[PDB]
Design a protein around this nucleic acid. Structure first.
Ligand SMILES: CCc1c(C#N)c(N[C@@H](C(N)=O)c2ccccc2)nc(N2CCC(N)CC2)c1C#N
Ligand SMILES: [Zn+2]
Ligand SMILES: [Zn+2]
Length: 842
DNA sequence: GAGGCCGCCTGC
DNA sequence: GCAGGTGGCCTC
């Protein structure tokens, strides 16, 4: 019934390989595709490709199945094409009995004219199917949700009869994960030295720089005891009646939980212990390294980092031995004097670059000079930026050196004007993108302004962030919301991508984009991208991990054309508060992460509010002078970078909103200590700037949940403080220094923590919003010491904008332009990944 | 124009 | 329960 067709080709031990088999009425040769029924009868058929056929000594006939992945098993779920399969690195040996039937699976390769095949309608993009047999076009990575072009691994001249792509690639992954040694250097009594070693595809030689976890070694200087903050001191509960609402010790924006950055070492020795027979134990690789001091690691504490370059180190003669498996990555450490270029050009010339000019003696606590032995382009893509705003994303991409934004679409006129100011020679369209795309498809060459429309082949990269108004909820779809989505700017942006078919595609959005409508917006976006034939992936990034003193999580969808390489998500550059670095995404109870491996530490210290704005001169509430003096040189590395090389005699847009007299008094009465907000306000009468009076807040009702103060005073301010009682209007009090609504509804709003809250110099900004309001949702917008809200310039600094970047309109317009923009450092990290792909193209 | 006021859901 | 994520709309 089942037997071989022919004679043997290789009798290896207990198995005998054959090239073709016969089962019942059909024949199977290697390369065909088969189905296997799972143990649960209702589950769909498993599909695989047969890569080897043999017979076992004690089991029977066997074959090797390289499994396909059903489209619904991927992140696309039910949105997938019901007959589309994906290549995966899943395979196993299986008894030939399990084979159910032979199936026809074809590879739909993109044509040589793929870039001109776009133009299908949103209905086809969202829901259209191939309407053919089983087909596959992309290889799928299930842990990172990555769709990429199928790998081109070639067989051998001796292992082609039993060749499995999955087996070969898994062997490659294991071998690269193995840390190995290389060319031997010397044989000592105790160990064997080597010149080079390999780990995760990275080569480490003697003298190279190594990242190490902060726990790898300690410094000879003592970590002198910091005075731990005592418990909450008793306060005058009558003078500060709302202080009791601060019973939690969690401070928003604090960096006390931020992890330490990497230890930096220089490889002095690579060695392995010797077995008693003299042969080295190459499974136990050790490295002896020389210690580098960050400035904050010297006897001078954290303050030494305020002015120093973020990549400046001090050589030391201290040494430490660590396991080779503890190395987190390779880095370059150079003595600055013998450098073929200036230190700034070096620092900007590549990743993981550090320099040292002096040495540090921990015992002496002085800076001597290092010893003698311490010594030793592509064309830019023409880019279309849809929903550009003032141009933060385009600016970051340009800083990465990958793009010339030749066309921009921005419907809001002040932001369009700002983009024009910063990008002369770029065509900015203020029309509806649907109107522009319809004109292009109709065959127009110019819009009603005479501006030349981009055509197929002009757009080499497409980037943008589309708003998601009308379907920004977490609840499941219905007919109305789904119609609103398929008529939305997200779908319009996808249509732009389908029509122009650029080499690279970037969709940026708020974090919750990955979860909208039960992750259905994300699933449909990925489905459209796959339908076009694009390689694609998604992830969540924290902007603070790339050089800004701001927590800003954003959703990123990346797509690469066939024949290109799919970019990786950038590894974090700066350590950041872990609470703000939760980047995993749950889709259909499956947890997806990005390729990022830097979870515990990073190469650079976190950027703080001090780094962000310590150099800006003091201004008053309602400051309106558009052009003032810096009154001094930049103080931090961040300030030097954002001020730039050319001297800037004028500071621009250091202006703040003119808050009312009551709000100004409230801000003036917010304490300067970290974590201070409205709950620290004193309950006093104060005469305002306009001659009017701000009155005491009278506590008129009893809060059984919150109780009474130390003086027996009540804590409720309205009848609603009772169980079922409704708000009596007569209980509403006006013009109180402590705003009435905050204690009115504080019990169900986490006591409105952060409203009228001051920033912390050692801390970071909360998400920079379009309009700073102390009593809004994001109310922690007060200056650390000045009695005002943050300025436009301070918001731009929090976003990482260069000081020369031009804004347009009134102060609210400029605030909105800053708030709506992608931070240029984040954009630049993404662009650097894109450049890696550009340089690595086959 | 600006200021007061403040529901609903999710992840842990 | 705690923390985070979303402005908008009444009313003057
Ligand atoms: C925490 C501050 C707040 C916000 C905010 N940011 C809010 N934004 C929503 C709204 N404005 O509809 C909303 C707008 C657009 C998209 C999604 C949601 N709504 C609040 N609600 C509910 C409605 C309101 N009528 C009473 C209080 C509160 C509070 N507290
Ligand atoms: Zn295999
Ligand atoms: Zn009430």
């Amino acid at each position: 019934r089942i037997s071989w067709v022919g004679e043997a080709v290789k009798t290896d031990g207990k198995k005998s390989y054959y090239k073709k088999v016969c089962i019942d009425a059909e024949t199977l040769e290697v390369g065909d595709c088969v189905s296997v029924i799972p143990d649960d009868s209702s589950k769909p058929l498993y599909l695989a490709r047969v890569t080897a056929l043999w017979e076992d000594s004690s089991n029977g006939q066997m074959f090797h199945a390289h499994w396909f992945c059903a489209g619904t098993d991927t992140v696309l779920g039910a949105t997938s094409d019901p007959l589309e399969l994906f290549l995966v690195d899943e395979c196993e040996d299986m008894q030939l009995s399990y084979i159910h039937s032979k199936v026809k699976v074809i590879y739909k390769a993109p044509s040589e004219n793929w870039a001109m095949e776009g133009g299908m309608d949103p209905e086809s993009l969202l829901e259209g199917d191939d309407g053919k047999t089983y087909f596959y076009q992309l290889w799928y990575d299930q842990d990172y949700a990555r769709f990429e072009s199928p790998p081109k691994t070639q067989p051998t001249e001796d292992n082609k009869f039993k060749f499995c792509v999955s087996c070969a690639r898994l062997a490659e992954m294991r071998q690269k994960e193995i840390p190995r040694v290389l060319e031997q250097l010397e044989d000592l009594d105790s160990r064997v030295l080597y010149y080079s070693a390999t780990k995760n595809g990275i080569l480490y030689r003697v003298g190279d720089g190594v990242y190490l976890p902060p726990e790898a070694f300690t410094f000879n200087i003592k970590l002198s005891s910091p005075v731990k903050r005592p418990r909450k001191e008793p306060v005058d509960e009558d003078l500060y009646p709302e202080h009791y609402r601060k019973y939690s010790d969690y401070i928003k924006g604090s960096n006390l939980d931020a992890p330490e950055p990497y230890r930096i070492g220089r490889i002095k020795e690579i060695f392995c212990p010797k077995k008693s027979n003299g042969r080295p134990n190459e499974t136990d690789i050790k490295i002896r390294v020389n210690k580098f001091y960050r400035p904050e690691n010297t006897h001078k504490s954290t303050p030494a980092s305020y002015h120093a370059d973020i990549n400046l180190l001090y050589w030391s003669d201290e040494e430490a031995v660590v396991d080779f498996k503890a190395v987190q990555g390779r880095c370059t450490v150079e003595y600055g004097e013998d450098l073929p270029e200036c230190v700034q050009v070096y620092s900007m010339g590549g990743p993981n670059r550090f320099y040292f000019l002096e040495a540090y003696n921990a015992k002496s606590k002085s800076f001597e000079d290092p010893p003698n032995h311490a010594r030793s382009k592509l064309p830019k893509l023409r880019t279309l930026d849809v929903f550009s705003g003032c141009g933060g994303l385009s600016e970051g991409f340009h800083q990465a050196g990958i793009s010339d934004t030749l066309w921009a679409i921005e419907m809001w006129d002040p932001a369009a004007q700002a983009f024009r100011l910063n990008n002369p020679g770029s065509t900015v369209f203020t029309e509806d993108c649907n109107i522009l795309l319809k004109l292009v498809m109709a065959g127009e060459t110019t819009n009603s302004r005479g501006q030349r429309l981009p055509q197929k082949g002009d757009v080499e990269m497409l980037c943008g962030g589309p708003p998601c108004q009308g379907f920004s909820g977490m609840n499941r779809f219905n007919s109305r919301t789904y119609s609103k989505f398929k008529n939305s700017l997200v779908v319009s942006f996808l249509s732009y991508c389908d029509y122009y078919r650029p080499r690279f595609f970037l969709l940026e959005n708020v974090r919750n984009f990955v979860s909208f409508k039960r992750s259905m917006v994300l699933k449909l976006t990925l489905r459209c991208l796959v339908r076009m034939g694009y390689q694609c992936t998604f992830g969540v990034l924290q902007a603070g991990q790339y050089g800004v003193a701001q927590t800003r999580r954003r959703a990123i969808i990346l797509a690469a054309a066939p024949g290109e390489k799919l970019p990786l998500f950038p590894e974090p550059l700066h350590v950041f508060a872990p609470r703000a670095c939760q980047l995993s995404v749950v889709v259909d109870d499956k947890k997806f992460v990005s390729n990022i491996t830097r979870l515990s530490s990073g190469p650079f210290r976190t950027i703080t509010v001090r780094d962000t704005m310590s150099d800006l001169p003091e201004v008053r509430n309602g400051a309106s002078a558009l052009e003032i003096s810096y009154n001094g040189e930049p103080q931090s590395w961040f300030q030097r970078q954002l001020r730039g090389a050319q001297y800037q005699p004028i500071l621009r847009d250091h202006i703040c909103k003119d808050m009312s007299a009551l709000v100004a008094a409230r801000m003036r009465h917010i304490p300067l200590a970290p974590g201070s907000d409205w709950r620290d306000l004193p309950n006093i009468e104060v005469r305002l700037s306009d001659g009017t009076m701000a009155r005491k807040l009278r506590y008129t009702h009893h809060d059984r949940k919150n109780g009474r103060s130390s003086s027996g005073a009540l804590r409720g301010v309205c009848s609603c403080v009772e169980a079922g009682k409704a708000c009596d209007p007569a209980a509403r009090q006006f013009n109180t220094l402590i705003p009435w609504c905050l204690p009115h509804t504080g019990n169900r709003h986490n006591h409105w923590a952060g409203l009228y809250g001051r920033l912390e110099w050692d801390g970071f900004f909360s998400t920079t919003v379009t309009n700073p309001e102390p009593m809004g949702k994001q109310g922690r917008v007060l200056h650390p010491e000045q009695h005002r809200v943050v300025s436009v310039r301070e918001c731009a600094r929090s976003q990482g904008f260069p000081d020369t970047y031009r804004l347009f309109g009134n102060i609210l317009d400029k605030h909105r332009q800053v708030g709506n923009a992608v931070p240029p450092p984040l954009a630049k990290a993404i662009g650097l990944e894109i450049k890696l792909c550009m340089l690595a193209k086959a």
